Ligand binder design. Structure first.
Ligand SMILES: Cc1cc2c3c(c1C)C(C)(C)C[C@H]1C=C(c4ccccc4)[C@]4(C(=O)NC(=O)N=C4N2C[C@H](O)[C@H](O)[C@H](O)COP(=O)(O)O)N31
Ligand SMILES: Cc1cc2c3c(c1C)C(C)(C)C[C@H]1C=C(c4ccccc4)[C@]4(C(=O)NC(=O)N=C4N2C[C@H](O)[C@H](O)[C@H](O)COP(=O)(O)O)N31
Ligand SMILES: [K+]
Ligand SMILES: [K+]
Ligand SMILES: [K+]
Ligand SMILES: [K+]
Ligand SMILES: [Mn+2]
Ligand SMILES: [Mn+2]
Lengths: 500, 500
């Protein structure tokens, strides 16, 4: 099976790419696996595959850390992400995001039901498993539980059957047969849960599939529109119908090659302690436990020699930056274009801890609008900050055509030199805020409202007659023939490879 | 003579350090020298010494580019600056700034007058030189003149004789015997000029010395207090009295080992076209010429085989970042401490194009103040933004003790995650603004007023009971013994030098 359609094949791809380290000696799921993974993510090293996890029994489980993190080289920086999508390992961020957006104006390709698959190789009923006996990692030393779920896909369906959502949301072990996790507005898992709560008749049928097709886990991390079934979006993206097998204990459908599947229910009535967890913005607040959603597990099915993917998330750079930020930025780019705004590109700078998105403006189109900074900032912020795709983003930075938004140094340059604090900004206090950012949930104001800003780093003439500067850099402040002469004589004079 | 006391010795030091490239083939001062220098600064390469400048005649002149720019290695990143100050080449930024501040609570050591020095080896009277015939560089292709003066020291004295100021301010050739340059408030050259204008009797006696003692050019770039003679500050810093020789045509005193000295007057009545120039924030606005101050040159004296230092300034990283930003930050640190504010460290992040300063707070002392963010932000901004040391800085970022302000990634992290836009900020509109920032002088508001902000990246409990988080990083979210085990087994497992 291709790497983008089968997690086991993806792990082989990373090996073949010399982007894997197999660790075959015993590693402790209590902190050690995650510490190694953390170090990998902070240094852009090879992904670790822990083949000998202390406490693995009956095939459950190995761990792959850092599945969507960065490679050291510039040339294949995003290669792990490219390997989720059948793209060359040298693919640019633009190419990755374009691939993720490509299904937005294609007909869905619905999934195909098959009778069995590798995820059915082994099973454990409700008398045979105990989630407290599995080698579930403690990811950070102050976490409030062992977070089994950092890179699996939750599957829930609307009561009427018309929408099946796939998404990533964290969850930790509560007891032998329950998890607790985050289920918060405006996320689709929460929207669907609310539908079942209003019906009031039963708990939500649920499955959680770990080690799903890589193309599926990418869509699971993207805020595609309300009501859109991720399986059909992924089908269209990849040009192939995904093969799914029915759960044993409910009528949901899981990817046939899933490494591990939990089947059960998401309660419409019960909660339990959840968190704290070392989160995407780089912090944990020890002791901050709150009630979360409660999941009951009725059955486990799994592949022979099952592998659990794990995100050891926190400070830069891991899946919470590469996937959450970039994929939200992609959706925001599309949203802006569909609202007739002249945005060509969007990216969430890693330097901003993916709390900013830089929006590149087609300034020719902006000039034709015959508008002003105040008006344009308000328009952009109204579109983005009132939409779910803008949920995680607290600062939008508008930049002109000279800025590559995929280059954080250039975004930072433009922000710092082109946006006058206060005057060139519009604050938004009556929008949904993202409580996970420390200055929100642990800050001075309402955890769930406000704290957003549009920062206009367009210069005044970009609205009127055109750019009126040249950069004071090698590229722009010297003629072509001189630049080339300098380059050609560089090593000859005495001064100091792309792949590396 | 020691490197910090003699520019010729400094050039030898850079050679000896393998931090110089001597270029002995012909190089054009029209753009080529500056393009090479620009490339050096953008790549942290070795400083270029142009020994064969097209148009050099009678000893005037060679050029040294990038005298205060960065080295590639992390271990000796700031070594060129260290070589200005007799510090080891591995000195930290903290150590460099502490050296620059050290004379602030020492008695001055006044200069010593000597009868002659190397700067008197050659002379040209007012019938013998023509500034349009010298190999003065065109630094950026759209500059409005040939900027002879990018790394020399202007010398002017108050009418009453009590204060002699040394400072860097740009100047370009106007005609055979005049320069035009920037002379703007609140700079000391401007303050002294205003004194002479109010007296109304004569033009200002002036000298401009190029290739001065390196320790002197550092103080020339620092906003030490009003009324303080830089020569005595440098004397105290270095522990030695600087040796100065009298000008021939006026009674000012110049460093004895100056490479090149211009003697003349700064007009109290005349102006001429000045600029545009590719400036510190990374921009030039072609055609934006304005009237500047006008200097008359009456005499040139110079060393045999004189060397002119040159800053090819613009985008990161050059002397306008390493010296202007860092030295302003140093002075701001001291100013805050002298106003009883609990600031331990200050730095202007390069990522901010040195328009921000991050202020590290001793949060134990802050807690004892029993204050709030609003109150503290207002206090800090009032102190800094109403002082000349704060002139160039538009955003102050307050951070707690866990943040190393000399590390831009950590400042950016703290700003992005701990300061809620709007609520955790105070805007200052009734302060002097820095017009050279594009969003000021070429922006939507007054060029000379406002546009400043204090951004509080202190978390709420930092004011009350203490930090209440741990970072989700390798350092903080794993115990010591596990961290060490991981490090010790890193290469063994299969994962990947300080000097490199
Ligand atoms: C890639 C990735 C995504 C997420 C997370 C993680 C990883 C690795 C971990 C490591 C588990 C950290 C937590 C931290 C998370 C967090 C919480 C809220 C917002 C963003 C992140 C969370 C989570 O617990 N809850 C959540 O509601 N969304 C999460 N997302 C974002 C989420 O997958 C996207 O938003 C997506 O668009 C959902 O689909 P849909 O609803 O549009 O169909 N989660
Ligand atoms: C290191 C360095 C410093 C400066 C400059 C340059 C270099 C290389 C060049 C490349 C020539 C670019 C221009 C761009 C400059 C610029 C203009 C205004 C503010 C900052 C920079 C300027 C300039 O033209 N005018 C100016 O008033 N101050 C300058 N400074 C700052 C100045 O040396 C300090 O502020 C110092 O504290 C002065 O002494 P004092 O008055 O306190 O005694 N200048
Ligand atoms: K999704
Ligand atoms: K602007
Ligand atoms: K000075
Ligand atoms: K704050
Ligand atoms: Mn969805
Ligand atoms: Mn001064």
């Amino acid at each position: 099976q291709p790497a983008h359609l089968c997690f086991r094949s993806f792990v082989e791809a990373l090996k073949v790419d010399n982007d894997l380290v197999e660790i075959n000696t015993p590693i402790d799921p209590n902190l050690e696996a995650a510490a190694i993974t953390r170090r990998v993510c902070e240094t852009n090293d090879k992904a670790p595959l822990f083949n000998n996890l202390i406490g693995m029994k009956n095939g459950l489980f190995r761990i792959l850390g850092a599945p969507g993190s960065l490679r050291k080289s510039s040339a294949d920086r995003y290669g792990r992400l490219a390997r989720h999508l059948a793209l060359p390992p040298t693919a640019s961020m633009r190419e990755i995001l374009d691939k993720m957006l490509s299904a937005s104006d294609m007909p869905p390709i619905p999934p195909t039901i098959v009778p069995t698959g590798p995820c059915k190789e082994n099973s454990l009923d409700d008398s045979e498993f105990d989630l407290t006996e599995l080698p579930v990692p403690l990811i950070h030393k102050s976490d409030g539980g062992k977070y089994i779920q950092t890179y699996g896909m939750h599957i829930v369906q609307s009561p009427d059957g018309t929408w099946t959502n796939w998404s990533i949301a964290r969850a930790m072990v509560h007891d032998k047969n329950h998890l607790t996790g985050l289920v918060i507005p405006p996320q689709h898992i929460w929207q669907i849960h609310q539908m079942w709560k209003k019906e009031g008749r039963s708990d939500v049928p649920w499955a959680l599939a770990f080690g799903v097709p890589p193309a599926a886990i990418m869509a699971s991390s993207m805020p595609i529109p309300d009501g859109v079934t991720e399986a059909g979006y992924v089908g269209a993206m990849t040009g192939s119908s995904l093969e799914l097998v029915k759960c044993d204990t409910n009528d949901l459908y899981v990817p046939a090659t899933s490494e591990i599947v939990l089947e059960g229910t998401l309660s419409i009535s019960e909660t339990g302690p959840e968190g704290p967890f070392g989160e995407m913005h780089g912090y944990i607040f020890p002791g901050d436990t709150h009630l979360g959603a409660k999941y009951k597990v009725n059955r486990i099915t799994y592949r022979n020699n099952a592998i659990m993917p794990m995100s050891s998330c926190g400070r830069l750079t891991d899946e919470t930056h590469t996937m959450i930020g970039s994929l939200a930025a992609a959706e925001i780019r599309k949203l802006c274009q569909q609202n007739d705004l002249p945005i060509t590109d969007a990216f969430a700078p890693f330097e901003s801890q993916v709390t900013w998105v830089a929006l590149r403006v087609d300034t020719e189109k902006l000039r034709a609008m015959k508008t002003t900074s105040e008006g344009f900032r308000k328009r952009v912020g109204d579109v983005v900050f009132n939409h779910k795709a803008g949920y995680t983003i607290h600062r939008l930075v508008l930049v002109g055509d000279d800025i590559d938004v995929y280059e954080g140094k250039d975004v930072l340059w433009a922000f710092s030199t082109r946006c006058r604090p206060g005057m060139d900004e519009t604050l938004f206090e009556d929008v949904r805020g993202f409580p996970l950012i420390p200055y929100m949930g642990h800050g001075n104001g309402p955890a769930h409202r406000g704290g957003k800003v549009v920062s206009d780093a367009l210069m005044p003439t970009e609205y009127t007659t055109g750019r009126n500067w040249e950069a004071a850099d090698f590229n722009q402040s010297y003629p072509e023939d001189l630049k080339q002469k300098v380059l050609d004589n560089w090593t000859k004079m005495g001064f100091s490879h792309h792949h590396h």
